[PDB]
Design a protein around this ligand. Structure first.
Ligand SMILES: O=CCCCC[C@@H]1SC[C@@H]2NC(=O)N[C@@H]21
Ligand SMILES: O=CCCCC[C@@H]1SC[C@@H]2NC(=O)N[C@@H]21
Lengths: 507, 182, 179, 148, 91
């Protein structure tokens, strides 16, 4: 046959991956093939593939036989466009050697990552792989490291997104951990370093793959995944939606798109949302929905550490990050998991020039020996450092109580915040009124009159307002308008810091 | 300036729309503010300002004026539309997405909301329902106190109380059955 | 202790120390003997993935001189984490007892040759060819195989050469380390 | 044999390059071996070698036979001192496949060049090679470019 | 400052010196300005300021004063030395 005909033969073979029977087996599991996933994710007719004909070079254990040669070698890589914006994508092909990672696999992934870093565009990885290709031995390990390094080199330069759509075990799990966001598909994807068999053999524990590393486990218990989706199709649609928010690189400002919601729209429904009695809770998500454009909010880790809320939204068409206390869960007290969840989100938002909006209603930190033995001190310091380090515009609104060091942590103006607002129900104090009266006036019998005077003078936002700790006390209904105005003024904020290789954040 | 955007050049949108267990093939094109839609072989024209933020949207379909509300939408394709005073749930997918959806496995979906359980440890301040009582969705069933926050438990759905497993002053724990609804 | 396996607490403890040393221009010396990560549901539910990524990122990010010595087994991703040369390490040495491999010899033989009855001969050949530092040395993953008695001398020499190490990185406000 | 003994065997084989008869043929031409040249060039006792055990990975035309495997693969690379100043050096070994350039050869040269650029020290190359290793085909070409 | 120099620590220099078609084994050590030289088994001491630029070099070999001139030298090892009025070529 001529060279051309062999070219068509190779193209056709590559387009089928591991064979039609393998594709059918993949489909009966309820999973799409890599190329189908790429087709769903990218704009139609925009996918440009790279390295179609690359094949593995292993020569051991009969790996050099023609039946062991697959063009592409279990990964499809290239570039495309989402809503017209450039992106680089790789998708792992489970039908070729179970999607195991080989030298060529890592080489292709590294090529696309280098291209993306060179031009400054995000990287999306659809992960479905058993693990390292044992037949290539140490070679596979090297490839993994080659990926890891690039991830670390790309951190804070271009956004990186991982979507776990199948089995993922061993060292391969670490690359998604190094990316900015990880999404999981329910019932068909899992993450764990060691499989259930080794767990049973070593620790005598009985567990299934779903229990060990299922999407629910990593979205509700381990705090490893950020979102879980029902299907591949649903996951890909939501992935496009989410990608619409991010900037292409750290050299670009926060994306601003066409907006129809007026920036001065009033929100009268917030004037009575906060109950007067501090013993009743409300839903901060309602406030967030009311304030943001079109009531649209993309929440991150919605089912993990629910006492805090983090997500993406738009104000006047500009992407913003939302962080808020949730009084509806555990009184809105901070703790370990919530601290970590807020801290990493804040750091990501700051790294890519996304302004931050914070809603503060926090009585303090969760007490108990479990929190202390778990290292609550360093975990809370994580969030405090995250707010203190950020140089993007920061807008804070205090809806209710803000007590003690928790007030400092939640982007207090003393952390070089930009604008801080207090609703009429705000309470900035060192601690509760009863405890403060107990400490201050203890040893005096006329406790009642002193306590009444103390509550009249201090159980309100006046102590902070008179000192300038809050820029103003605003009617809740105007909240949105105020915020929008500020975000227009602060768009050109620029701050000077001492030079350093990097900081040393608590871990 | 650093990266100019390249407009996705699409002339026709081929959509599979599911209204009431029926799947309709739709071909939609636009010119300015005028959308030409072929639905199962019938041609219609829709005109409007297409203000996607206002709660009420006024449109003209073949000269007939309609006022519609978009109550909610999702990236998946679900959409709730108030039309002629009734709220219809439609599911819109692209043709390719609809074709690929055929390989997705139907999930169990079993999640009974009849049973109401304690979310967090605390003490039951009061119980507002007794067996045989009628509870509307969102109606409080009991109140649980923890760290003096008066947490409120709400009925999952409208119904009656098959059994009340909690009493006032009892220290409940997380994942503890509180009440049963039919 | 615990066969030298990595876990959550050890990962965090190593990661922060490495980051501090890098921040203030202090060279790093690593001694590698690690079979893998501690298994169990407690480690998985505790977020072992992100905590281990912490240490891996700490080594990958460092730009101070890094010298690594492998005394014994180094298996799987744990080998990558412990300042492997692929993380832009400077000098990597292996003692005669070093073992760089994807996993244990018995498990590798089980996976590779499973379905063949003549397991014993294949396992013997596999152990003879791979249960040693030669697979890494022949590919350049380790700069040399050294006598243990010379270790100190070698290290000292390297620390004199690498004192002027300077590396270029892309600009950024900061990275986004897993937390 | 134990792993240690195989280590001494590999060290001894590498120190001889392509064999004693090849060394004699080199000498009768009036030329020194690569290691002798390095010894003459550098300060005594200052040479630190890198990648002694690196071998070529070609598997075509019977190149995978044990008789075609040479530790070091026709190039000796490392660092040393001249009058106390640091320097990086590579010397091509003509006795191994005529000194032809293979993937491992270029890999070793590139490693030393990257190290020298990282620390900021000069590079000296003693060139004695027939050319590209034809058995490795395009691979050899790539290596050359990597050097260039 | 960027790269401190590491002094080559040598205690004895073993040299082959060719004078007139004869090759002599020499072992030379130094301490300060005093060089101890063993030539074919004979020990000598040479003292001088070792000013390598002045045309005339004054040395003391075992207390005997000598004036020598270095007419030329090469990296290869060749050296022309005026000694007792005669120019000798050594390698
Ligand atoms: O039983 C109630 C008296 C003490 C409650 C103090 C609460 S617990 C949540 C918050 N965090 C603190 O440190 N104190 C308050
Ligand atoms: O009972 C012994 C068989 C399995 C032991 C595997 C060990 S446990 C420590 C190390 N980490 C792993 O993932 N595997 C090894």
């Amino acid at each position: 046959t001529s060279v051309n005909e062999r070219i068509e033969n190779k193209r056709r073979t590559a387009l089928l991956g591991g064979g039609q029977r393998r594709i059918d087996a993949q489909h009966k599991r309820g999973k799409l093939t890599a190329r189908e996933r790429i087709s769903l994710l990218l704009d139609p007719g925009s996918f440009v593939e790279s390295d179609m004909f690359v094949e593995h070079r292993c020569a051991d254990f009969g790996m050099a036989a023609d039946k062991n040669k697959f063009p592409g070698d279990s990964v499809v890589t290239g570039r495309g466009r989402i809503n017209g914006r450039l992106v680089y994508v790789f998708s792992q092909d489970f039908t070729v050697f179970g999607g195991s990672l080989s030298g060529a696999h890592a080489q292709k992934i590294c090529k696309i990552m280098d291209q993306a870093i060179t031009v400054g565009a995000p990287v999306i990885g659809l992960n479905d792989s058993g693990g390292a290709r044992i037949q290539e031995g140490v070679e596979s390990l090297a490839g993994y490291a080659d990926i890891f390094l690039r991830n670390v080199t790309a951190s804070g330069v271009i956004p990186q997104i991982s979507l776990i759509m199948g089995p993922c075990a061993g060292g391969a799990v670490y690359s998604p951990a190094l990316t900015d966001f990880t999404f999981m598909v329910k019932d068909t994807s899992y993450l764990f370093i060691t499989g259930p068999d080794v767990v049973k053999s070593v620790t005598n524990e009985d567990v299934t793959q779903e229990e060990l590393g299922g999407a629910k486990t990593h979205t509700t218990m381990s705090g490893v995944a950020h979102r879980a989706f029902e299907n591949d199709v649903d996951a890909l649609c939501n992935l496009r939606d989410f990608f619409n928010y991010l900037p292409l690189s750290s050299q670009d400002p926060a994306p601003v798109r066409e907006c129809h919601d007026p920036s001065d729209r009033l929100v009268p429904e917030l004037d009575t949302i906060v109950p007067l009695e501090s013993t009743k809770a409300y839903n901060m998500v309602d406030i967030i929905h009311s304030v943001v454009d079109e009531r649209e909010f993309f929440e991150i880790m919605p089912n993990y550490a629910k006492n805090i809320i983090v997500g993406f939204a738009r104000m006047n068409g500009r992407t913003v990050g939302i962080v808020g206390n949730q009084p509806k869960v555990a009184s809105g007290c901070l703790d370990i998991n919530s601290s970590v969840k807020g801290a990493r989100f804040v750091r990501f938002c700051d790294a890519f020039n996304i302004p931050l909006i914070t809603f503060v209603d926090v009585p303090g930190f969760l007490p108990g020996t479990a929190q202390e033995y778990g290292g609550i001190i360093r975990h809370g310091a994580k969030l405090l450092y995250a707010f203190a380090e950020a140089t993007v515009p920061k807008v804070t609104v205090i809806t209710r109580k803000a007590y003690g060091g928790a007030y400092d942590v939640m982007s207090s103006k003393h952390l070089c915040g930009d604008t801080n607002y207090a609703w009429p129900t705000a309470e900035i104090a060192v601690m509760g009124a009863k405890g403060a009266v107990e400490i201050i006036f203890k040893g005096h019998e006329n406790v009642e009159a002193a306590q009444a005077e103390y509550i009249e003078k201090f159980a309100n936002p006046f102590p902070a307002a008179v000192r300038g700790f809050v820029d103003d006390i605003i009617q809740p209904s105007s909240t949105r308008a105020r915020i929008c105005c500020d975000l227009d003024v602060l768009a050109s904020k620029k701050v000077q810091r001492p030079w350093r290789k990097h900081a040393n954040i608590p871990l | 300036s650093r990266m100019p955007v390249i407009k996705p050049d699409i002339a026709n949108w081929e959509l599979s729309v599911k209204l009431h267990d029926k799947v309709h093939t739709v071909v939609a094109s636009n010119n300015g503010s005028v959308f030409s839609v072929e639905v199962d072989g019938s041609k219609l024209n829709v005109t409007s300002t297409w203000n996607l933020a206002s709660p009420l949207l006024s449109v003209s379909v073949d000269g007939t004026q309609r006022t519609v509300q978009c109550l909610s939408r999702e990236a998946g394709g679900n959409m709730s539309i108030q039309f002629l005073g009734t709220v219809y749930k439609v599911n819109i997918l692209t043709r390719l997405a609809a074709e690929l959806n055929k390989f997705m496995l139907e999930k169990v979906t079993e999640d009974t909301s009849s049973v109401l359980r304690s979310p967090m440890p605390g003490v039951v301040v009061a119980v507002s329902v007794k067996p045989g009582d009628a509870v509307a969705e969102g109606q409080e069933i009991c109140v649980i106190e923890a760290m003096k926050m008066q947490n409120s438990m709400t009925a999952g759905k409208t119904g009656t109380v098959k059994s009340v497993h909690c009493q006032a002053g009892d220290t409940v724990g997380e994942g503890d059955l509180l009440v049963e609804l039919e």
